From a paper:
Protein-engineering methods have been exploited to produce a surrogate system for the extracellular neurotransmitter-binding site of a heteromeric human ligand-gated ion channel, the glycine receptor. Acetylcholine-binding protein is a highly conserved ortholog of the pLGIC extracellular ligand-binding domain (ECD) with properties similar to nAChR. Mutations affecting key residues in the orthosteric agonist site at the α1(−)/β(+) interface affect the potency of both activation by glycine and inhibition by strychnine. We therefore set out to generate a high-fidelity surrogate of this α1(−)/β(+) orthosteric binding site using the 2α1:3β stoich­iometry [Fig. 1(a)] by exploiting protein-engineering methods and the thermal stability of acetylcholine-binding protein from [name] (AcAChBP). Ultimately, the highly stable AcAChBP framework has allowed us to introduce nine amino-acid substitutions that have resulted in a stable surrogate for a heteromeric neurotransmitter site that binds glycine.
Variant I incorporated five changes: [name], [name], [name], [name] and [name]. The key observation from the structure of the variant I strychnine complex concerned the [name], [name] and [name] substitutions. Trp164 NE1 donates a hydrogen bond to the carbonyl of Ile135, thus linking two β-strands from different subunits. The electron density of the phenylalanine (Phe164) was poorly ordered, perhaps as the reduction in the side-chain size of an adjacent residue ([name]) opened up one side of the binding site, allowing a greater degree of conformational freedom. Neither variant I nor variant II appeared to be able to bind nicotine. The combined [name] and [name] substitutions may open up the binding site such that nicotine can longer bind in an optimal fashion. Variants I and II presented structural features consistent with site-directed mutagenesis and electrophysiological data that suggest interacting roles for specific residues.
Numbering used by the authors:
A (entry chain A), C (entry chain D), D (entry chain C): 20 to 224
B (entry chain E): 20 to 230
E (entry chain B): 20 to 229
The structure:
Amino acid sequence: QANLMRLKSDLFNRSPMYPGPTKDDPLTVTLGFFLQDIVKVDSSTNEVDLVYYERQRWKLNSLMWDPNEYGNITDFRTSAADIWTPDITAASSTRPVQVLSPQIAVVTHDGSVMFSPAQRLSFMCDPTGVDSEEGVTCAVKFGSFVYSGFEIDLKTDTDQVDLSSYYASSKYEILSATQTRQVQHYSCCPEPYIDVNLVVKFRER
Amino acid sequence: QANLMRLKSDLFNRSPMYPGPTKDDPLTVTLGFFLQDIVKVDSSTNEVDLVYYERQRWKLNSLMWDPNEYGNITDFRTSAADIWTPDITAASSTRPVQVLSPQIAVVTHDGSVMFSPAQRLSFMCDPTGVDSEEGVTCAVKFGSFVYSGFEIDLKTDTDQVDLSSYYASSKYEILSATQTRQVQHYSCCPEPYIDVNLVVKFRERRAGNGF
Amino acid sequence: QANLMRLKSDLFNRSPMYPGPTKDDPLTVTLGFFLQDIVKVDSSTNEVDLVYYERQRWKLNSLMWDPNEYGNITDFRTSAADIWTPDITAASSTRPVQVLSPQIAVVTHDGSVMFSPAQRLSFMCDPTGVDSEEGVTCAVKFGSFVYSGFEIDLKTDTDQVDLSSYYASSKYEILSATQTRQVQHYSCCPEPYIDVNLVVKFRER
Amino acid sequence: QANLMRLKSDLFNRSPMYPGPTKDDPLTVTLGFFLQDIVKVDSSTNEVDLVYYERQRWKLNSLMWDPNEYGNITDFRTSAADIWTPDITAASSTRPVQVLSPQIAVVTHDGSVMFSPAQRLSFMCDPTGVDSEEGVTCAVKFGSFVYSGFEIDLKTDTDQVDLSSYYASSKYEILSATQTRQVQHYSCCPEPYIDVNLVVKFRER
Amino acid sequence: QANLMRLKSDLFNRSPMYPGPTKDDPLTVTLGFFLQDIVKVDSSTNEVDLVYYERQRWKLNSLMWDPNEYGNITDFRTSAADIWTPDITAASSTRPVQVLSPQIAVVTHDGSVMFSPAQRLSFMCDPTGVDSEEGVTCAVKFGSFVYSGFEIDLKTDTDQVDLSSYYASSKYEILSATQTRQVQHYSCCPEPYIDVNLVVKFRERRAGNG
Ligand SMILES: O=C1C[C@@H]2OCC=C3CN4CC[C@]56c7ccccc7N1[C@H]5[C@H]2[C@H]3C[C@H]46
Ligand SMILES: O=C1C[C@@H]2OCC=C3CN4CC[C@]56c7ccccc7N1[C@H]5[C@H]2[C@H]3C[C@H]46
Ligand SMILES: O=C1C[C@@H]2OCC=C3CN4CC[C@]56c7ccccc7N1[C@H]5[C@H]2[C@H]3C[C@H]46
Ligand SMILES: O=C1C[C@@H]2OCC=C3CN4CC[C@]56c7ccccc7N1[C@H]5[C@H]2[C@H]3C[C@H]46
Ligand SMILES: O=C1C[C@@H]2OCC=C3CN4CC[C@]56c7ccccc7N1[C@H]5[C@H]2[C@H]3C[C@H]46
Ligand SMILES: *[C@@H]1O[C@H](CO)[C@@H](O)[C@H](O)[C@H]1NC(C)=O
Ligand SMILES: *[C@@H]1O[C@H](CO)[C@@H](O)[C@H](O)[C@H]1NC(C)=O
């Protein structure tokens, strides 16, 4: 109790918040999707609803501490509002994302943060052919809203999306689910943007 | 008035908030479900909506006081925002939980906290067979979102879910309702996670069973 | 202006907020319902939607003042967030209550508070028979969420619910509407809880 | 920039917020409705949805300044949260009002405030006959929620509702739209309440 | 880290917030629409739902800094709540705008701000004829809610709306999309108001142009 209280107070109250990465001090965020359910499909609007956990990881020097100075504490939990979090956003949503979990991150003594919120997302997807054997493929890109590749880079720890919690009696079964880093240029903006492309092939069960 | 004001000021203003449990100082939270209503079932999405009270209990040394130092006060009520609460979450929801009550906890002189909010949850459930006599079974796990078994443990005071306030004219009648501690390992994470599994067998309301 | 500003500053800024009632210093809240409209009925879910004003009254010593010390001011209006309010809750709602009005209370020199928000409530009710001549009866209990009878007691000023603002072209007409204090014990909890039971008999017009 | 910053700091930071009108220092609020669209009608619930601007005006001595002391500034814009606003509310709503605009007021050197938010309101209205040539009439009262006629009075600058922005391809055309001050006594309350009654006659196109 | 922290503290904590433009010190905001999807059309209410990015740009002297005084930093990102933003609003919405993105702006050393939120808007539009080959045209004006032309002026960098991110399998295909500055007088108000008029011609997705 006493040690952890002091640690948190030293980090968050006594110094200013991390102001985000820069070209001089860029940052790599690791992303992993754990798909839980394709809830529904709206063929009149081409919107599809997913439930998933999005695991995000990154490391800041300003969150480091020596465990021996603070009661042998190696890690702690804290409200995501107490720390900088990356502005990772789906690029083809049609509604604001619904958060289905507390927003709490895990900070380790080496400055590592793991943050893994559950979300329901409605996104752009034509479900024509979902009732077939072939199924249908849809995709959604996730990346930083304001940070280019020179400030935020993304990687995945694997190309395969974790389907081990996928709801077995979902109305839709997953044929394939991948997550793949991409570099992209858009007419809006001079500098390149990095995303992870979630590609899901699925059909009616 | 005067004594309780001082007690609250001593606890909440004069010291920092409890920063949650750790591997060295873990915590056991007790859970009890009081099921009120199965409001609806959506067979086109396999989502079902429950209304229930979730009673949570735990005990902190940092919330202890001697009643004789504070006007013989044994317990008080306070906004849940004034204290640490455990991050107990349903593991198969499809919408954000709707809170149907004030969020106020009861703190006792021994450091016990009881906190019992009402909620409406939509969760993953195939209702195929609900219109039968047999009914249908669905389940939802409740556990800490970020704390493993080494920091937060769960127990129940009984396997039986309290159905004594269940809405008698619900469209769905409850056949059985249990709540059972489980230990689980997931591919995401090295350390084990504890949940309480709410298992509810229910069917569309009938006038008469079988002969 | 000048007097009222001082009064409010003396009460709310210069002393702590009232921490709620206790067994030693319990409190009585008076409830009165003014039913405006039964908007709809959902027979597929047994939910019914009411619009109503819930008048709440109570009296605190910590809100008293002498009018002669403050420009002859006998009462004032203020945001409900500036004061303690009782945690009166419907016991069989199925959605969070929608507030249809500002949340402003009236405080009188004797420490009386009147607080009278407009609300839309969805609650548990089987409407089977609403299309009949007999109609249908439904009920909903209102009481403190955390305070037992030893801390908060409830009374009504009358058994009859005020229907004088009821929408004349509602789809549902009210046959009867009562509000009745009750004492209750529940298996969860050792001490007794007080509620006011709103009982409404109504039918299609 | 420099002058306006000082003016705002003099008014809002250096003195307390206006605590609302009283019997000794009452206030007149002027109301004007600018009707934009009748979006829809629900005949199964007798609810109708309007989009409109509600222009509110009032004058406080505590917001006066001499332009010559502050760079010749005659008026400025500011967030409505920085000032007291009146609690004018529709008396027969069935959902919370949706705000469709920024909430920003205009303050003039004489202490005048103009505040003119856009809103979507669902309110109690039987649309039976809207498909006829005669059309249908509906009405909704707007008034202070907590201030009686002794504290807040209302007036209009005209009996005619401004239809000059009304959506020309609305599903419903407006036949007539008036706004009329009323004095009212209710069974709840001893003192009189003032409202402006918005009366709209409309039909299908 | 250290330099940027100081820069932000110098600008936002040590001086007061910009109180908005005036007749003496007016401001020009540049607008650019990037249309993503026409999600749906409701012919029973004449409401249509768009998803789009609205790029807003303006320049304040009070946000200038010399890069050489602050570790060679030419620009930074920050929460839109930390700065003044213009009150640009759709003039014929029927619901509150849904924000589909973080609200973060980019500030440059010359005092330039770029702010580009994603939004879903429901607005007044009669879709009669959307199922035809000709399609249907709808329009919505965007302008300052409280600032007249004497305080806020608007311009576009181009008349053409960017459709390069438009969802290719939308239920509705875009035939044309323009954005055009206008000056307007209204019966409410003596002084003129500036808007940019977003005009979109669209139809139900076909599979052939006939
Ligand atoms: O037009 C676009 C689409 C594109 O979407 C992928 C993600 C991106 C990251 N941010 C989010 C806003 C955006 C941008 C800025 C200014 C105008 C339009 C615009 N967007 C996105 C764009 C990239 C780059 C940038
Ligand atoms: O994929 C999962 C499923 C599983 O759900 C039961 C509850 C858990 C408690 N927390 C909440 C998020 C979660 C987690 C972290 C990182 C990636 C995926 C992931 N989840 C849940 C998981 C456990 C562990 C952990
Ligand atoms: O199980 C219940 C039902 C009952 O509902 C009527 C109102 C009450 C006032 N508060 C609200 C929460 C409640 C309570 C506490 C702990 C477990 C279950 C539980 N509830 C309600 C109960 C009473 C008492 C208490
Ligand atoms: O019962 C009512 C209906 C009536 O509605 C018109 C507007 C009014 C202004 N305020 C809003 C709340 C109200 C009031 C106070 C206490 C109990 C009931 C009650 N209301 C409204 C009433 C008036 C007076 C008062
Ligand atoms: O009544 C109106 C309609 C008109 O709508 C187009 C947009 C405008 C920009 N602002 C937003 C509010 C408004 C205004 C001010 C005071 C009373 C009514 C009123 N409005 C809009 C008006 C213009 C001008 C002004
Ligand atoms: C840390 O652990 C050591 C043994 O490794 C133990 O003796 C000590 O109590 C702990 N130190 C602190 C400061 O808690
Ligand atoms: C960065 O560094 C040099 C000096 O080392 C400076 O003169 C230059 O203008 C800076 N910025 C850019 C964009 O090169």
